[PDB]
Amino acid sequence: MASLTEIEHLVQSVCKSYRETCQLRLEDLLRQRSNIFSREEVTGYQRKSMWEMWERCAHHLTEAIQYVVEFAKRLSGFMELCQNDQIVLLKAGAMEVVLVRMCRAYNADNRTVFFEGKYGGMELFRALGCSELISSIFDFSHSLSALHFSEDEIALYTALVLINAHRPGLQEKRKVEQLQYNLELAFHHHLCKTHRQSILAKLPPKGKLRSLCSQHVERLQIFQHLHPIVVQAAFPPLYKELFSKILHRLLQE
Ligand SMILES: COc1ccc(Oc2c(Cl)cc(CO)cc2Cl)cc1C(C)C
């Protein structure tokens, strides 16, 4: 099943779905690299309360996750899976896709990330009280930056992050296995055609994205135990559904 012509069509389809669902174009991010937060603006972020900084980060992640949902809806074969499996895949993989997409907003030259209109280092997030998780995220983005991914490679790699037939709870595991296998062929065919197969051994182990997502859920539990009413009243509903139904509504639209 699936011939060479069909594999190449899938490559172009995934790349197109990714381009249409990017929050900001790569060119926009690269053109902002000299726009760095001043020492006074960094101090301002560090002086914010922990709950206000958490709310700002949860809002930005929720917006990023909305683009990932749209990417999934446009992904060939995803809407053909049952709704149980669409929700299982998105609950487990949406944050993983956001964390990979984040390398596009990361500048390896000065270790800064584009956040709220300017580039800032890890120290910008000190008020969160989760230095280990923030350090891990920056290290992860640095590791991806070292691969020099093209937009097409991020599109194919993120499609595989999402279409993972090993997620617990899948009712139609074989159908997800088939889609995953076609996407693996599409990704490996593209790498082979562009002489980029050397990146396969340099991609992060699957346990790496899993540990970042588990650390996020653990830090959110600590924060929610200290500020339960802040989470109830001021965190985005989609964020609480995934990490603490909206997903079903987004998938129906
Ligand atoms: C996975 O958890 C994350 C992920 C990111 C995060 O903070 C960031 C946000 Cl919202 C945006 C950018 C630039 O796009 C970079 C970082 Cl480090 C905080 C958390 C926790 C504290 C909610």
Q: Where are the domains of the chain?
A: 1-253
Tokens standing for 71? 């990417």
- Ligand 1 atom with minimal separation from the 220 CA: 22
Quote the crossing angle between the two packed helices 83-101 and 50-74, to the nearest 10°. 120
Tokens standing for 133? 């998780």
Q: Whose CA is nearest to atom 1 of ligand 1?
A: 216
Q: Is 170 left (phi over 0), alpha (psi -120 to 50) or beta?
A: beta
Handedness of CA 240, 83, 170, 14 (dihedral sign): negative
**Cα separations in angstroms, 237 against 55, 164, 194, 202, 245:** 12, 25, 42, 36, 9
Asked whether 231 lines ligand 1 (CB < 6 A), one says no
Q: How far is CA 127 from the centre of its chain?
A: 23
Class of residue 49 by CB neighbours under 10 A (exposed 0-12, middle 13-18, buried 19+): exposed
Kind and range of the H or E run holding 118: strand 118-120
Asked whether 60 lines ligand 1 (CB < 6 A), one says yes
Handedness of CA 135, 242, 225, 232 (dihedral sign): positive
Strand partners, 118: 115
Asked whether 137 lines ligand 1 (CB < 6 A), one says yes
- Ligand 1 atom with minimal separation from the 138 CA: 17
- Residue entry with tokens 């830090």: 219
Q: Name the method of structure determination.
A: X-ray
Name the residue of 61, 98, 103 to mutate for ligand 1: max ligand atoms within 8 A of Cβ.
61
Burial 33-48 (b: 16+ CB within 10 A, else e): eeebbeeeebeebeee
Distance CA 129, CA 54 (A): 9
Task: Return the biggest CA–CA distance within the chain.
Answer: 59
What is the SS3 assignment for 24?
Answer: coil
Quote the crossing angle between the two packed helices 50-74 and 206-226, to the nearest 10°. 140
Distance CA 235, CA 226 (A): 14
**Cα separations in angstroms, 213 against 23, 124, 206, 227:** 21, 21, 11, 21
Cβ neighbours of 69 (radius 10 Å): 20
Residue 133 · residue 219 · CB < 8 Å: yes
Distance CA 160, CA 180 (A): 6
Task: Give the helix ranges, DSSP H, for the chain.
Answer: 4-20, 26-30, 39-46, 50-74, 83-101, 131-145, 151-162, 173-193, 206-226, 228-234, 237-243, 246-252
